[PDB]
Design a protein around this nucleic acid. Structure first.
Length: 94
DNA sequence: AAGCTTCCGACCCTTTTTTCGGACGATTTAAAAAACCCTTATAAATCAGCAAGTTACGAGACCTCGAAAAAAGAGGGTTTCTGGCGGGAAAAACTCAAAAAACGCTTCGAAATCAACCGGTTATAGGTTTTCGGAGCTA
């Protein structure tokens, strides 16, 4: 089955129990907040080994509903993007 | 006159100090015993170096007992080091709950993509050098 954030909390807490469990979740949800905020402010998120996690742009377009098929105008906007770093790349490549 | 209380004399018994006598030791003096001297020509000892045979004194050894010293064993005590148990506070699992947040339905058309190779970006592993904190110290 899949791992979740709720399961990360406990597994980190087992492999780093010497830190307070709640200092751990505190840390971990603040650091997710930090990276998401960095994206929301239009910034890189670059690291080594892991990879880099970044932003991309979409131009305005006339899309419209898969259900109803009714014209919908859309303005230009940004979206997150992620490229895996060659260390993680090869770790996940069986 | 009677009863109670307090001295006083008589005495009984044992311990402590003094005096006297007796005994023993030491010293002195006198008496007794052993000894020294004076007469001897003749008999026996003196001694010379070495051999041949013997031993009185020394050395070695062991035992025996007793005592002395040392070592062990015992007992008295104090200081401290550790372990077990008990108790309060914090953490984190456990239980209870909502509200988001994701997922699916479901996308035809818009990105995402990998591939190889160049130059360029930059997070940061690693190392290098240095303020802050604490060492307590001392009255």
């Amino acid at each position: 089955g899949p791992m979740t954030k709720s399961e990360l909390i406990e597994r980190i807490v087992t492999h780093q129990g010497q830190l307070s469990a709640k200092d751990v979740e505190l840390a971990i949800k603040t650091m997710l907040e930090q990276m998401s905020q960095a994206l929301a402010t239009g910034d890189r998120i670059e690291i080594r080994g892991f990879g880099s996690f970044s932003l991309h742009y979409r131009a305005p377009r006339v899309g419209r509903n898969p259900k109803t098929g009714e014209s919908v105008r859309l303005d230009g906007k940004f979206v997150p993007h992620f490229k895996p770093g060659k260390e993680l790349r090869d770790r996940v490549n069986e």
